[PDB]
């Protein structure tokens, strides 16, 4: 009769690009007027439909596209649209142009770390494991005393079996404090041992106890399973740089040291390339190269604008997306040479420039309405028009910013929607980047 429901988990927060859901193109390759949260920029959204096909062709390697335009014109919005269109499986690497300055590794090497992180890989691995409750454990002895064999009895639901294992497995078992009656899970690819606690049968033995009890495992004592794994080249490279696998003492104690980055040499990269090629030839490894997104590219030091010449002419380097919003500026680290967008001409010749233009007042209202319905606020027509004129006066970012506090004041006094009075009062409370400049230049002598 009485219907009751429960819902206590909170929703996700709203970012600055939470409404962009795709490029919103058509099958013919043209650009709509308003689709998937994007309006306008037809000449730029159409040019981004070529790029997604270029990514999905898995053919080229070492192509760069540079999005250029005034601030607030939707560069990174287009980049996130491309990333959303390409799907989750394709690896996407966000990056800021100011991250190449590090105190541990050189500027040049971070670019490689990001390139190798951009390229993905899919592996179909097979792991054979022995699981179950230990019923008997015995270390064998031989001539020096040393240990040569380990005898382990594992009892699953199906039954029990006895196994002879390498002394390294015995060392790992003694390391984890494994006795009889404790459920264990050993994998034979790496020799790792995991203890889950005593069996559920030994529950009433002790009135007071601290160990957790797991039920008896079901299935066979020894079994192999297939695991599908998504990895990148940079994961293999970093794992082989400072290894942590294995049950020895060198890697165990390397697991505890401070994780400092290191400069990977060309030899390890080449050997990893050979190994992954061998994996591909076996019909298991599938390559899925992705996209690296470099934002604010205009502030890479000249030592990074020039290594990219050799870094992009490679046959492995993925597709790189640049983004800049600067005019004829001086190149950082040069103090004498000026160039468009800060990027030098020599590197600029290797990129395809996607021009971006400023927005018209008509699209401003549509963008504001889309953002308002994304946040979850209701705005009247006159208030939306007033926000439109405000945006035409200063910028659309300011209009988007004003949407939330206006709703706050609207819901303070019982109103359910934003009115013109709320927008005007908010515009009075907060200042623009240009009005504040005026009131600052008026009193410049006294600051």
């Amino acid at each position: 009769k009485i219907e009751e429901v429960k819902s206590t988990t909170k929703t996700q927060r709203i970012a600055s690009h939470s409404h962009v859901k795709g490029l919103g193109l058509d099958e013919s390759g043209l650009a709509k007027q308003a689709a998937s949260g994007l309006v306008g920029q037809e000449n730029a959204r159409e040019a981004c439909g070529v790029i997604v096909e270029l990514i999905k062709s898995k053919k080229m390697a070492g192509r760069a596209v540079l999005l250029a335009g005034p601030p607030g014109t939707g560069k990174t919005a287009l980049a996130l649209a491309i990333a959303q269109e390409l799907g989750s499986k394709v690896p996407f690497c966000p990056m800021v142009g100011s991250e190449v300055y590090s105190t541990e590794i050189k500027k040049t090497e971070v670019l490689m770390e990001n390139f190798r992180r951009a390229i993905g890989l899919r592996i179909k691995e097979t792991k054979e494991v022995y699981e179950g409750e230990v019923t008997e454990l015995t270390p064998c002895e031989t001539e020096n005393k040393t240990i040569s064999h380990v005898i382990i009895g594992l009892k699953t639901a199906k039954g029990t079996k006895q196994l002879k294992l390498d002394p390294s497995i015995f060392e790992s078992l003694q390391k984890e404090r494994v006795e009889a009656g404790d459920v264990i899970y050993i994998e034979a690819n790496s020799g790792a041992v995991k203890r889950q606690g005593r069996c559920d049968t030994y529950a009433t033995e002790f009135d007071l106890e601290a160990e957790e009890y797991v039920p008896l495992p079901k299935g066979d004592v020894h079994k192999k399973k297939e695991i599908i794994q998504d990895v990148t080249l940079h994961d293999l490279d970093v794992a082989n740089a400072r290894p942590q696998g294995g049950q020895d003492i060198l890697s165990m104690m390397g697991q505890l040291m401070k994780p400092k980055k290191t400069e990977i040499t060309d030899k390890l990269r080449g050997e990893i390339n050979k190994v992954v090629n061998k994996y591909i030839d076996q019909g298991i490894a599938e390559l899925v190269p992705g996209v690296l997104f470099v934002d604010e590219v205009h502030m890479l030091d000249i030592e990074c604008f020039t290594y990219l010449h050799r870094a992009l002419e490679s046959s492995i380097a993925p597709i790189v997306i640049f983004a800049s919003n600067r005019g004829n500026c001086v190149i950082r680290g040069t103090e004498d040479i000026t160039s468009p967008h800060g990027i030098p001409l020599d590197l600029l010749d290797r990129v395809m420039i996607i021009r971006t233009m400023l927005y018209t007042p008509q699209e401003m209202k549509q963008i504001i309405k889309i953002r308002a319905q994304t946040e979850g606020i209701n705005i009247s027509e006159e208030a939306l028009n007033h926000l439109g004129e405000i945006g035409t006066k200063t910028t659309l970012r300011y209009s988007v910013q004003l949407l939330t506090p206006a709703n706050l004041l609207a819901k303070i006094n019982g109103k359910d929607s934003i009115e013109k009075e709320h927008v005007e009062e908010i515009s009075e409370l907060f200042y623009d980047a240009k009005s504040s400049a005026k009131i600052l230049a008026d009193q410049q002598d006294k600051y």
Binding site: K1, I2, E3, V5, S7
Partner: protein, 48 residues
């Protein structure tokens, strides 16, 4: 039809129900409870 069927089945059948025989039996309370599907459930429902 229904009246004819009731007349036909009236002689060689009985019935009591709960009011005739329950002299002290609290009326059971029936409660519905909607439950929302989780993330994984939704990924699978989408696949389906």
């Amino acid at each position: 039809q229904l009246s004819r069927l009731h007349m036909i089945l009236k002689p060689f059948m009985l019935r009591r129900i709960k009011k005739d025989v329950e002299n002290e039996l609290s009326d059971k309370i029936e409660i519905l409870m909607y439950c929302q599907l989780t993330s994984r459930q939704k990924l699978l429902y989408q696949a389906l």
